[PDB]
Amino acid sequence: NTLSPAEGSKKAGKRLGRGIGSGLGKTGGRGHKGQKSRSGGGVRRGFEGGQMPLYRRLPKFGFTSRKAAITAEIRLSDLAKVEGGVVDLNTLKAANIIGIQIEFAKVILAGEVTTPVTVRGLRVTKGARAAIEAAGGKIE
Amino acid sequence: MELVLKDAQSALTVSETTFGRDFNEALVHQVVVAYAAGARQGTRAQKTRAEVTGSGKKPWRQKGTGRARSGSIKSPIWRSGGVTFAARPQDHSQKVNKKMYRGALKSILSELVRQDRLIVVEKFSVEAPKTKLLAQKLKDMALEDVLIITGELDENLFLAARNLHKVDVRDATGIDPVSLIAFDKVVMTADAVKQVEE
Amino acid sequence: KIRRDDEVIVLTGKDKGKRGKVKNVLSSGKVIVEGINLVKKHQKPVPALNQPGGIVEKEAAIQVSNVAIFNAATGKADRVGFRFEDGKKVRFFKSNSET
RNA sequence: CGUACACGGUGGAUGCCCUGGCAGUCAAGGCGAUGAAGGACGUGCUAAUCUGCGAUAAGCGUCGGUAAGGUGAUAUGAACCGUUUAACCGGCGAUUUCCGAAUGGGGAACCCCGAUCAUUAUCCAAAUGAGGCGAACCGGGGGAACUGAAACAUCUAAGUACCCCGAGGAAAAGAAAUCAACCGAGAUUCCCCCAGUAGCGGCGAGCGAACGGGGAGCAGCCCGAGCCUAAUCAGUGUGUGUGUUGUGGAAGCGUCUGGAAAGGCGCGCGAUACAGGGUGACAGCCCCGUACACAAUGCACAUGCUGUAGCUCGAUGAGUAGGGCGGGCCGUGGUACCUGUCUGAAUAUGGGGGGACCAUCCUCCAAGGCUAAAUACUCUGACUGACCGAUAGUGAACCAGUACCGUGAGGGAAAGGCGAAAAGAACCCCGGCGAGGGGAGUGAAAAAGAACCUGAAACCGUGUACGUACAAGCAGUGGGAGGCACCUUAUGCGUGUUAUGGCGUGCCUUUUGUAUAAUGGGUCAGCGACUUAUAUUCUGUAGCAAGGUUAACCGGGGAGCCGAA
Prior knowledge:
The structure is cut from a larger assembly and holds chains A (140 residues), B (198 residues) and C (99 residues). By secondary structure, chain A is low in regular secondary structure. Chain A has strands at residues 74-77, 106-109. Chain A is flat and about 75 Å long. The A-B interface holds A 5-18, 20, 23-25 and B 26-36, 86-88, 94-97, 100, 104, 148-149, 165-166, 177-178, 181-184. The structure holds one RNA strand of 565 nucleotides. Chain A: One of its GO terms (biological process) is cytoplasmic translation. Chain A: Part of the 50S ribosomal subunit. Contacts the 5S rRNA. Chain A: One of its GO terms (molecular function) is structural constituent of ribosome.
């Protein structure tokens, strides 16, 4: 009724998870305590991302290679068999999650189930010759 | 299982529905307190397109500060600007997540399928024009004390319920944890339950 | 509301029964009714309360909670005086419910 | 004289309250040569301040609103005004001193005139402009250093701080001699993303795009001649809606406690009206007010209408493109942009561009111009706040930017609360006394009497308990003896202090070692020092599992990111 509701206001929803006693970021509360790294710990942090360097000086160094065509697009047997049907050449790949704004791919026989659908691709490996030959179709 | 719906006559049974998600009474208590807190002010900082004119503003010395409209911001020097310290995004609010906030939204939907909770009401509920009719359907329902809890529905905002105690009407589309549980508690309608599924 | 143009009827204080016209309304919420006064040292009919003092606040200081202007209800009070040029206020005055 | 306590005081903490601040949000947004902003001096019967006006001086007139009382904050004394309807709240007009852009000339507010520059020009200042102000936003120029690089000359901080000139309420850009995933996109900004990628760099530290895509918002058009005219231009009439502000009005029971209920208990009621305030204590139904409706103001932008007026033909802009010398600046690399000196083309049967140069494709055509829309503060009005609470919060809840300091620029406090009502101590005694004291009165309470609620600690006086002028020093613990004093915690069970005896060198940092002739503090209270986003890497807990998460923007999105050899 017109009485101070036993409780019906705002402190309700849900504690993120476990009893959040106070806001995060708390470690060594106000005042003095540890929470740090004794010794030369102060004016500046320790690491930097390099070294003296004894290791970074001149190990078995390499270099910055030139940009590649950016092939390597997983096109596995199955997931292309137990799905859709025939006609799976360059035009119907967007349907599947096989569509890089770049080019090329490869077939990786994750499964063996017969299909026997055909697939162009523009690439090929062992197993790409196997199958789609014993099943039918033509690779390019 | 099967959630027994109720008719206007608060009949013992009607259709059935439910939500599947490990309900967490660890997912129904603060969140909206954070909503209650966070929803009320919070000086972010950089969030603003304020820019600098540089020198030559107006015939007078005007430091090229992160200005905007006619007053400076962002810069820790002027108010409403970004705090110059470390660990807190807005004002006195609870830092945190998009997932738990939602996880609480999912988990809450599941809270409904709990014995000591709400109950599903047939669609006809949305028809009730007068408020008094609701009070009755709440009495026979044996959940009149739920007025201390809250209320909800589907289709459109229920004008007949809006009046009722601590009633903040909401629709199955846009419902926030706060609604699903105006304090880890609530009540909905048949269609609402279906809409919320998405 | 209360207007200095309305006649009031005390009901609680020792001036219970006296009738008179208001003399002025203060922001404090105290009203002075014409007739409700006190007897000064040199016998001067001036409104005020009671206790030894010096310079002082006039008016008997009456509370609106114990006065009786119009008050539709089963009470012992009777008639009360009241603008007219408004017209709309005349309709309310004519209604046994409003004024 | 040591300690504890008691009564009173000091002091002002604390608790409660707060007519103030702090923060966020919505709305609204310019003022001035018909001389403003600001300042000075005046003005009310008495008025010193503040406020309002200004010599028709806290005011005059008109209309509307409002309403019977009123003569600002100050509730004084006297007096006066109002129903020939005032006070009070809103449009328009009149008046509107002097200085001040002032502008005749001079000048620390005083004395005599369009000053100075400039355009038109009947060259007469005759007709006009500029010359100032305004919180910070946009644009155009000039342009550091401390600092980082743990040194420093590139680089970095900076194109920042600071200097100059100018606009608007908003500014800049802009219809492509573009982009360059193409049988394609296709004006320009801005947001997200693409990217921390390409690129730059003692390639050291660091620095750092764009195309595209997803969105917001969309509009395209002007210069020689021929011809002719519904674009434009001038003028007229003149809103809706919306936004802001203001406005209309009735109603209170029973029992108990109390000085009084807005209490407790019982019963009942309203709600397109589950804001707030007031009223002798926690009143949604006692009063205002809130729904409702009305009125005023701003909006005034627009639309309609009168007279104006299409369209056609050809070309299309050189000290430029470009080259050389010397610099600035940029992410700009032989591949950014701009300045200065010198040199210097061709023309669409031409030329430029697609991130190196020169001959062969695709795209587009500079060296002329304009162009709506997409946001951004907080002076001002209103609202809100798990914000602070008067050594807190704005420096300012109290005369505050006042008192006060400095030649000046400039600097800069502290001070909140009587009581329901003042109802604020009548009368009497005392005294040098409107001081004060006693007595007495009011009230629930003055153990509220006026820097007056509550009122602590340090501390003062007195007094109480107990010591105490042979006594040795941490000033205790345990044991046993002495007593004195008190039996609101009856039980051979305790307190206050204490005589005597056995032991006992405050407390904190630095240092190998400090009680230490090592440093710091006279005492007290209050004050007084690890925090933000992002990214990376672990850990504990929890959900679901090769899938998983979205970002801008829409409850959808999957761009994109990481993982999958």
